[PDB]
Amino acid sequence: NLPFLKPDDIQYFDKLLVDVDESTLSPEEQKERKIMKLLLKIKNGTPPMRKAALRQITDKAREFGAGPLFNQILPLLMSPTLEDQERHLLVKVIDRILYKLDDLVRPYVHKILVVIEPLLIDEDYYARVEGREIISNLAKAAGLATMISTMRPDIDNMDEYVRNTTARAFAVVASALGIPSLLPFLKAVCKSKKSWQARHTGIKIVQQIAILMGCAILPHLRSLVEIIEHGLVDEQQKVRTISALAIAALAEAATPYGIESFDSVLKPLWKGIRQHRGKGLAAFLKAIGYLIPLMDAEYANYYTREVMLILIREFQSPDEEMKKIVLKVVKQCCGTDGVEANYIKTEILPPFFKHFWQHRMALDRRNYRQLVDTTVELANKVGAAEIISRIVDDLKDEAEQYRKMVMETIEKIMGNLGAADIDHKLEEQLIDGILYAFQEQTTEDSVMLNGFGTVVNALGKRVKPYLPQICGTVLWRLNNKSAKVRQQAADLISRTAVVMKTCQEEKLMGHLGVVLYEYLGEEYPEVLGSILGALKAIVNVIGMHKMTPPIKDLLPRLTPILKNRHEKVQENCIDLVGRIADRGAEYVSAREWMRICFELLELLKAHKKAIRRATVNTFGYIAKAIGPHDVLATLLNNLKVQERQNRVCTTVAIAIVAETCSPFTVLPALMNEYRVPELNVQNGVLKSLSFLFEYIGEMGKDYIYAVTPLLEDALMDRDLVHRQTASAVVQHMSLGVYGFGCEDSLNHLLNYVWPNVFETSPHVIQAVMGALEGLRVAIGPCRMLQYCLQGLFHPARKVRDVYWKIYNSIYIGSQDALIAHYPRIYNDDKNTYIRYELDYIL
Amino acid sequence: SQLEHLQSKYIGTGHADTTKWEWLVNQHRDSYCSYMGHFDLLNYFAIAENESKARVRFNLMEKMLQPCGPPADK
Amino acid sequence: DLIFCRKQAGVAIGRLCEKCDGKCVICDSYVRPCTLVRICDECNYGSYQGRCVICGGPGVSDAYYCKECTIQEKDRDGCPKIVNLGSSKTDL
Amino acid sequence: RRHMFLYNLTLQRATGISFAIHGNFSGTKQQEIVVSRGKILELLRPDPNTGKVHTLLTVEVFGVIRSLMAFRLTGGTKDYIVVGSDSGRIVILEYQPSKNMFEKIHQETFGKSGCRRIVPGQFLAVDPKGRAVMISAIEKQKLVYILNRDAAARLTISSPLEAHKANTLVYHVVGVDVGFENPMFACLEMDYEEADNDPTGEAAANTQQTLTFYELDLGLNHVVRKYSEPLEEHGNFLITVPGGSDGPSGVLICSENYITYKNFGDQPDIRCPIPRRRNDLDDPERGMIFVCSATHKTKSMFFFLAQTEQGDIFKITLETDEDMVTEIRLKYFDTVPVAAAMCVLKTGFLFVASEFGNHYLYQIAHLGDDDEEPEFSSAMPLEEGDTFFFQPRPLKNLVLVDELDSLSPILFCQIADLANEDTPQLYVACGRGPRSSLRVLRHGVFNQVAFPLQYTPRKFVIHPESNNLIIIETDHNAYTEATKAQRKQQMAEEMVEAAGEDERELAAEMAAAFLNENLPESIFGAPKAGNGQWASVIRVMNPIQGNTLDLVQLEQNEAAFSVAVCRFSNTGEDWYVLVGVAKDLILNPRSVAGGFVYTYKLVNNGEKLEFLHKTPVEEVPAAIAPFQGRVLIGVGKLLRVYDLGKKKLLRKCENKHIANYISGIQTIGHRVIVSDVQESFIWVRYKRNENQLIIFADDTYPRWVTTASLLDYDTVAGADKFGNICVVRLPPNTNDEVDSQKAEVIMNYHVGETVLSLQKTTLIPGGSESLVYTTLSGGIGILVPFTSHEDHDFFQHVEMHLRSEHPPLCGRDHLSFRSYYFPVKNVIDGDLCEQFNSMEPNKQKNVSEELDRTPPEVSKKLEDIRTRYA
Ligand SMILES: *C[C@]1(O)C[C@@](C)(OC)O[C@H](/C=C/C(C)=C/C[C@@H]2O[C@H](C)[C@H](NC(=O)/C=C\[C@H](C)OC(C)=O)C[C@@H]2C)[C@H]1O
Ligand SMILES: [Zn+2]
Ligand SMILES: [Zn+2]
Ligand SMILES: [Zn+2]
C-alpha cells in the first residue's frame, strides 16, 4: 500500500492521494507520478520498501532522465521540515542516480549546484559533508570540463561570498577528480591578468583544497606552492593575504612533511613581515608559524631567530586576532627541535609573560584556552618551575577568573612534569596560592579542586608540613552551610588520601573520618556519595583496626544507606561496605552481614553495570567472610518462596556463593532441592545451575559428574521447559570447561542432549542447538561430525533437515578443522572422491 | 531476531536437497585451500612428489575448477 | 519483526543505552564482557553515531560481546545493530 | 596413575621460510628482512660490511602466517609490516628498534578463524603509494582498507570496503603502480559457475583464466570491477611493473612456458617464452613456470629477477617507446636453489630464501650486462614451438657471502649416543632431493654437522653392533644414475644422427663435451623424470665421520619406504637388513604394481650389504619391524609375521582387517600397534600358541598418523599430518582376547607444524625423561611431564594470564590455536609462558602478584624447567 503521510509531506505527494486512472495521464505525468511514488516509498517506507524503491529508481534512472528526477528531488532535499536521516536517504538516492545517469546530468549541473550549495555552509557538520558529497558525485558524473564551464563565470564575481562559494565548490571538485586535473586551470586563474578577484579566488581554491584534503595533498604540494607563490608579492593586498593563508593551510595539511616544497616561499614571507602590517602581516606570521615546525633543527633556529623580533614586537598588538595568531606562532616555534630552551628563556619568556599574562585575557574563553595551552606547552620544553614561578603569586589575585586561569595552567604543568623541578620557595608559594584560591571560592570551581589535588599529589611526601593547614581548611569547608562546598571538600579528601597516608598524619585522618561519619545523614544525595567516597578513602589509608569510628560502629551505620535510591550513593556505599567486608569483617557479626546481604540482593538487578559489579564484589567478600551455609540456606528458601522477579537475584547470589566458597558447598544442597516433586522447584534449581556454570566457568571442570544424574533426569523429563533449561546448563558447562579435559563427561551428556533435536517447540530446539554448539567447542567438531554423518543423507526429509541444520552450524564454526575429520568417500564410475594428497606417506 | 538465511549464503553449507557431488566438491575445495594455507601440509605434499611448492600450488589451484570431475544430470 | 543488520562492521564502536548497560547484544547475557562490539558505517552515520545499538537512544557505555560469544566467534558475524523491519526512518 | 600433564617448549625454532620481505623497518638507511617461518615472525639484518645475516628479533605469533607485505605512506621513512593469517583479522605492525619488538599498530577483524576457503587472509596486496591494502581469500571475498595519517603522523585504518564475487577463485593479487591515480588491484581469477552446471564437462575445459583490474575510487568510496580480460595461458602469479613517472605501470603475468606484459587500455599484450635449458635432461613433456620473483627499482632502470623451477634466475627488463612497452628482454643471470622468496637490497646483495634446506646471501658482483652471453627478447622471431635455449654455468654474477643453516624439512630423527659423548646426539634426516643431508646436532641452541646425501631420506635405522646408519633415500620424478647416464648417451647419439655430415668433427665432440660435463645437482637440480618414475638407494654410513661405507642402487621405478636391521632366531647372530620398496607407484591417482622386500646380510662389521634375496609382495611394504626373531611387515592393508627363508621370506601369519593402509608398526610384548593412514592406531594381539593376529582395540577418532612412540604397555603417543600431537591410552586391564575396546585420548595439542619424529628420551644424562619431536619446518621441540601439581597449577595460571595480557601478535586466540583440530587437553604452552620476559614491566608485575611472586621469581621458575628439561 501507500506509506503514511505527515502534514509536511502533503505538498510533495498530494498527487498520490487522488486515485487517478493511471491510463489517462500524460507520459510526462506518468513519469512524474512514478518518480513521486518511488520517492515516497524511499522517504517514508520500511527498510524493504526503501531497498526495493531505491533499486528500481536506480535501474530506471536513465529512463526517467535527470530532469524530472532532480526536479522532484531538489525541493524535497532542501525542505525546511526535512529530518537529518531523510536528508541522508535523499543524498544516497542522488549518489545512485548520478552514478547511473553519468553525462546526462550535464545540462542540470548549474541548477543542482545553485540549489544545493547552501548545504556547504550549514551549521550541521553532516549537512556540509552531504553537500560536498553531492558536489563530488556531480563532478564525477558530469566531468571536469562541464564543471569548469559551469563554475568559471563566478571566479571574478564582485561579491566576495559568491567567490567563496565557488572556491569551496572547486575545492570539492578537485578532491573528487584529483588535484592534477585542476592544476592547469588553477595555474591560469591564480595569475589572471584581468582582475585581482580571479587570482584571489584561485588562491582561495588552493587553500580550501588544503583544508579539505589534509595530508592527501602531499604528492602535489610542490605544484600547489608553485601555482600560488607569486601571490605573496601581488600588488593587491587581499591577494597577498590569501596567499599567506593558503601557504599556512598547505603547511598545516602537510605536517610534518613537505618543508622542501616551501623553499621558494621562505624568503618572501621573511621579507613580508618586515614591511606589511595588519591582517596581511598576521597572515604572513601564521604561514611562518605553520612552516617552522616542518624544518630541521639548524634552519629552524635560524629562521625563528630571523622572525622573532617582529613576533615580539607584535606581542603588544591591540588587535585580538593578531594576538591569537602570534600566540599560536610562539607555541609552534617553541615546540620545534632546534629552538633552544635558553633562547626562549632569555628572549621570548619575559615579553610573553608581561604582555599575554594579564587579567584581561582570562575573561574571554578563546584567549583563556589558547594562552593556557601555550603556556603549558612552553613549560614542556623550558621547565615546569621556570613557568610556574612566573605566575604563582597571581594565584592570590582577587580576580577569580584570573585565579582560575593560573590554577588550570599550573595544574596541567604539574600533572605533565611533576614537582621534581620545584624548589622549596616555589613549593611554599604554591601551597599558599592554592590555599588562598580554594578558600576564596564563590562558584565551586572544579578547576580549583583538580589543581589542589594534582599539586598535593605531585608534591607527594613534601606536603607533610602543610597538611595541618590543608586539613584545617578541609574541615572548615566540610562544615560549610552549603552542601556543595562539603561535597567538594570530601572529593579533595578522596583525591589526596593516598599522599596524606604516605605522610604519616594518621591523627588528622582519623578526625576527618570521624567528621565524615558524622555527616552520613546528609540529605543531598551527591554530597552523601562524595562523603561515602571520602570515608572509603580514609578507611583504605588508616586501616581497619585503627579506624575512627570503629568498623563495628561504621558498618551498621552503612546498612540503612544501602536502600538509598540515588545511584552515586548506592555505588559509593556498596564499595565502602565491600572493602570493609574484604579486609575487616572481623568487627562485624554474622547477623549484621546477613542484613547487609538481604539489602544487597535487590541491587543485583540494577541497570547500571557499575552498581551490579560493586554488588557482586561485596557479596562475594561477605560470603567469603561468613561462610556459605547460612546464606545458602536463606537463598534456597527464597528460591522456593518467590517467583521470577527476585528469583534471578537469588540465582546470581547462589552462583556468587558457589564461586567464592567453592561449589562443593553449594551444589549438594542445591541438587537436594531438586528432589521435591513440585516441578517449579526443579525448574528453579535448573535455572540456578545454568547461571552457576555460566558464572564460574573453568571452576566447573570438577563438577560435571556431580550434576550429571540430575541432568540425565531433566533432559528426559516430560516437561520441555526442564529439557530446555538442562540444555542451557549443558551449553554453559561445555563453554565454561572448554580446554580443561572434561571430554568424557560432556560426551556422556551429549547422548542425552542429542535425542531432543527433533523437538518442535522453538524455545526448546533453540536451547538444544546452543548446547550442541557449546559441545562442539568443548568436545571438538569431529565428534559432532560423526554424530552428523548418519542423517546427512537419511531417506526421511525431516531427518535431513535436522541434521543439515546441525551440520551447517558445525561447518560454519569449524570449516578448516573438518578437513582432518571428513570420512573416506570412495570413487564411483563417474567421479573422483578420493583426496589422494592425504594418502601420501614419505 | 533470528534466521538461517545468512547460513544459506555461506559457501559450503547444505540442505535436505544437497547432493553427494556438491558435498564432496565443497570438501575438496576446502581441502585444497587448507593445504595452501597450512604451510607444512603443502611441504609434505611437495616432498612426496618431486615438485616445487609453486608447482604444487599451481596444480592445486588448477584442480579447484572441477576437483571431482563433471557432475551428474540427475 | 526485528533482525540483525549483519553488514560488514567497521571501525565504529557500538554503544548501549542506560537501560541495557553491560548486556551482550547477541545472547542477552550480563556475564563476563569480552570483546568490543563493532558496527557498520551506515549504522553509525550522522545523528545515529554513538546511539544505542538496540533502541537508537543515547549511548552511555561501550557494547561488548560476552565471553561465550567470543569463544564461539559469534563476534565475527557482522554488525549486530538491531533493525526494525516494520518501522520507517523517523518512527518511534 | 593420573593422566600426564605436559609442558611444551621449542628447543630449536623452525628454520624454513615461506615469505621474506625487505625494507627500512628501523626507519634508517639500514635495510632489514622480515621473514615468516610459518608460525614465527622473524626480523633479520644483513650487515653490508661483513655480509653476514644476523637475526634481530623472533616472535611466536601462535597462528598460520599466510601473507606478509611491507608498505609505506608518502613522505614516511619507515616501512610498516602488514600480515594476513588464519585469525580472521588483518594486522599492521611497526618494528621499534629502541625496544626490539613488533608493536601492533592496527588489528581489524572481518571473519572467522582458520585457513578458510572464503574468509580472507591468504592474499595481501598493497597500493605502491601505501594508500590502500586489499586482503583476499582464495574464493569470493576480498576486502580493501584505506590507510592514512593523522596530525601526529600516526597510521589510521578505515572500515573495510567489499569487492566480493560469487563462484570466483583467485590465483594471485597484486597492487598496480598507477602513480597517484585511483588505486588498482590486479587479480588472476577463474569463474567455476559454468563448470559446476555442465554435466558434459567441457564448460570446464572452455573456462579460461581472467586478469581483472579492480579500481578503488577514493572519492566515491567503493571498489568496482573495472577491467577484466581472458588469457590464453593460465598464470600462476603477477608482478608489479613500476609506474607513474617510473615506468609503464602494467602487470607481468607469469605462466607455464611464457611471461606476458599486460595493461588495460590500448596497450597490447607482449608475450615472450621462457628460455629453456639446452640439452635439458628433464622429461620433455614437462612445461616450465617461475617459482618466485623480485623487483628492484633504481634511479635509472628497473629490473626483475624471475627464477625457474630449476633454480635459474633470469633478469627481466622492459623496453619502452612512448609510454607503451616495445618488448620484454630476458637474460640468464645465475643458478641458485629453488627459492620461495628473493630480496634485492640496495647495498648490492641478494637474499635467497630457499623453499627447502639452507638459505643464502649472495653479493651482486656484476649486473651481468657486459658479457657475450646471449640476450633474449619477445621481439626476436621464432616459428612453431621453438623456444630459445641457453646453457647453465657456475656462479658468474653472484658470489656466496653467507649460508643460513635450516633443518627444513625433517623426515626422520633418532636421539642416541653413537659417539660415546655420554650425552646423546640428534641424528636427523634433513633436506629434499639432491640437497638432502644427514645432520648430527649436539646440545651447546644446537651445533650441527651435515653429511650430504643423494635423494630424500625416508627412514634410517641404527645397527646395534656397528653403530652405523642404514638410510633409504627415495625420490619421485627422478632417474637412477644408470638411467641418467643412459639418457645422456642416447641423446648425444641422437644429436649426431640428426644434423649433417658437414662437420661431425664438431657435433661428435660437442656431444662428447656434453657428456663430459656433470653439473652438480646440488646446485642445478636433479632432472625431473616424469610421473610414476622413482629413484631410490640404500646407504650404510658412519655417524661420526661422513663416509659412505656402502651404497646399493635400486632399479628404476623402485621406491624404498621401509628399512629394518634385525636378527633371526632360525639363523644365528648374523645381521640382516630388510628394505621394502614399491614398484611403479603413482601418487595421484594412487596405483601400484606391487612391491619387493630386499633381504641383505650385513657383513664386515656392518660395512657391506651382501644381497641375500628379494621377496615379491602384492602391495607396498610400508613398515618393517623386528619381532622376537622374526619380522612384522605391513603390505598395505595386510599385517604379516614373516620368517627368514633362504630363498624367500615366507608368510608365517597374517591379519587382513586393517582399515586402509599400514604406515607404521611398533611392538611391546605381544602387543603390536599399527598406524593406519587415516584411522589412527589399531592394537593387534599376537597369540603365539595359536599363531594368530587379532584386533582387540582401536580409536574413536580418525587420525592421519605420521609417527608414534610407545610410552608404556597401554599408552601410545602420536603425531598427525595436520600438526597435532596426541596421547591415547587403553583402559586399565584391557583384555587382549575380547572383541572391541576403545582407546581414551588423554592428550591433545596443536604444535602448529607437522611432526614426523617423536621419541621418549632424556637429552641430558642425570635429567628425567621427556618427549622430543621434530617437524617438517625444521623445528625441534619437547613435551615435559609435570611432577608436582603445584607447579602444574602455577604454570597453568601463567598461561591463562599470558593469554589475556599478551595475546598472539597476528590476532589469533591462543586457546583456539592450540585447539585447532581437537580441544587442547593436558598440555601447557611454555613458548607462551616464556613471553613473560617480553612484556612491559607493569604487566609483568601485575600478573606476577596475581601469582603472588616477583617477576624475577617467575622468570627463574620458567628457566628452571628449561635447564632441567624434565
Ligand atoms: C536492553 C534491555 O533488554 C532493555 C530492557 C528494557 O529490556 C526489558 O531492560 C533490560 C534490563 C534488564 C535488567 C536490568 C534486568 C535485571 C537482571 O537482574 C538479574 C538479577 C541479573 N543480574 C546480574 O546478572 C547481575 C550481575 C552480573 C553477574 O554481573 C554483572 C557485572 O552484570 C541479570 C539482569 C541484570 C535491558 O537488558
Ligand atoms: Zn549495520
Ligand atoms: Zn537501548
Ligand atoms: Zn553473548
Numbering used by the authors:
A (entry chain C): 463 to 1304
B (entry chain B): 9 to 82
C (entry chain D): 7 to 98
D (entry chain A): -2 to 441, 773 to 1198
Text lifted from the article:
Splicing modulators alter the splicing patterns in cells by binding to the U2 snRNP (small nuclear ribonucleoprotein)—a complex chaperoning the selection of branch and 3′ splice sites. The U2 snRNP has a bipartite organization, exhibiting a smaller U2 3′ module and a larger U2 5′ module. The latter contains the heptameric SF3B complex, whose core subunit SF3B1 is recurrently mutated in cancers. In this work, by employing FR901464 analogs as molecular tools to dissect the splicing pathway, we elucidate how spliceostatins/sudemycins interfere with prespliceosome assembly and splicing commitment by covalent coupling to a reactive zinc finger of PHF5A.
We have engineered a variant of the human SF3B core that lacks the β-propeller BPB domain of SF3B3 (SF3BΔBPB). The complex formed crystals in two alternative space-groups, belonging to the orthorhombic and trigonal symmetry systems. Our best orthorhombic crystals diffracted X-rays to a resolution of 2.3 Å, while diffraction data for the trigonal form was limited to ~3.0 Å. The distal half of the SSA molecule (C11-C15) establishes hydrophobic contacts and hydrogen bonds with the hinged pocket. The proximal half of SSA (atoms C1–C10) extends away from the tunnel towards one of the zinc fingers of PHF5A (i.e., Znf1). Its epoxy-tetrahydropyran group is recognized by a hydrogen bond network, involving SF3B1 and PHF5A residues and several solvent molecules in the binding pocket. Strikingly, SSA’s epoxide group resides close to C26-PHF5A—one of the four cysteine residues of PHF5A’s Znf1 zinc cluster. The electron density is continuous between C26-PHF5A and the epoxide group, while absent between C26-PHF5A and Znf1’s zinc ion, indicating an intermolecular covalent bond between SSA and C26-PHF5A. Notably, a thiocyanate ion replaces the water molecule at Znf1 in the orthorhombic SF3BΔBPB-crystals that grow in 200 mM potassium thiocyanate. The 2.3 Å resolution of these crystals enables visualization of thiocyanate’s distinctive elongated shape next to the zinc atom.
